[PDB]
Design brief:
Elements lengths: L1 H14 L1 H5 L6 H19 L5 E6 L5 E5 L16 H7 L15 H6 L1 E10 L2 E8 L2 E2 L4 E5 L4 E8 L12 H14 L4 E6 L5 E4 L3
Parallel strand pairs: 1-8
Antiparallel strand pairs: 1-2, 2-7, 3-4, 3-7, 4-5, 4-6, 8-9
The structure holds ligand O54.
Length: 205
């Protein structure tokens, strides 16, 4: 079954996290977690659907990334038997430095997070799914109605994976988010730190 195979993938990531996300002891991997989530919101911006991305560092050391795009698709594709979103989130770099890392997908971020929450606003409805190291708590479900559209991912990195540098560095995220808004001109990126009230808005016209 997909369940056993999904778990086998998630377990591969957790056993050699460095290989997938980058170094787990110097902050490379930790901050790369944010950038992987951001990258898919950037693709949605570049295709002309999302105008703003908001990255928030919370006081409990989680990070959320939200966009105003179309929302990750929610329907169940006949081949997989669960939402397309859950497939994206769950189905599947050691010595790389900073911008030399290659992209590995948000299912890696999910595997290496103690908790992750996905909230999709799409087709008139608010949809929610929660994960613990990639394992959904329940099927993606409808929790309300909305005229808005977009996707939000919030994740709590696992301290079973990350050591030494365990708390996000505002300056690392600021530097790279600014570079990303330069490298993908037109897209507005905001960074908010709830620990100390700092905010920035990066946008090149
Ligand atoms: C907070 C992070 N934002 C998104 O992931 N936005 C996003 C992703 C989409 C993906 C997607 C998500 C993750 N990985 C991949 C490869 C695609 C597929 C299709 C649509 C319409 C999306 C819309 N918004």
């Amino acid at each position: 079954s997909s369940s056993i195979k999904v778990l086998k993938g998630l377990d591969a990531v957790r056993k050699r996290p460095g290989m997938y996300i980058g170094d787990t002891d110097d902050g490379t991997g930790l901050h790369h977690m944010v950038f992987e989530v951001v990258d898919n919101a950037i693709d949605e911006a570049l295709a002309g659907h999302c105008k703003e991305i908001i990255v928030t560092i919370h006081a409990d050391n989680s990070v959320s990334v939200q966009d105003d795009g179309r929302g990750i698709p929610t329907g169940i594709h006949p081949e997989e038997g669960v939402s397309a979103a859950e497939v994206i989130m769950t189905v599947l770099n050691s010595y790389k430095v900073s911008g030399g890392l290659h992209g590995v997908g948000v299912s890696v971020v999910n595997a290496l997070s103690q908790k992750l929450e996905l909230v999709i606003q799409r087709e008139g409805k608010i949809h929610r799914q929660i994960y613990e190291h990639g394992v959904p708590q329940a099927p993606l479900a409808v929790t309300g109605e909305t005229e808005k559209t977009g996707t939000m991912v919030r994740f709590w990195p696992s301290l079973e994976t990350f050591t030494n540098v365990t708390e996000f560095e505002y300056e690392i995220l600021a530097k790279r988010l600014r570079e990303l808004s330069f490298l993908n001109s037109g897209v507005s990126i905001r960074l908010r730190d709830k620990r100390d009230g700092k905010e920035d808005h990066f946008h090149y016209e």
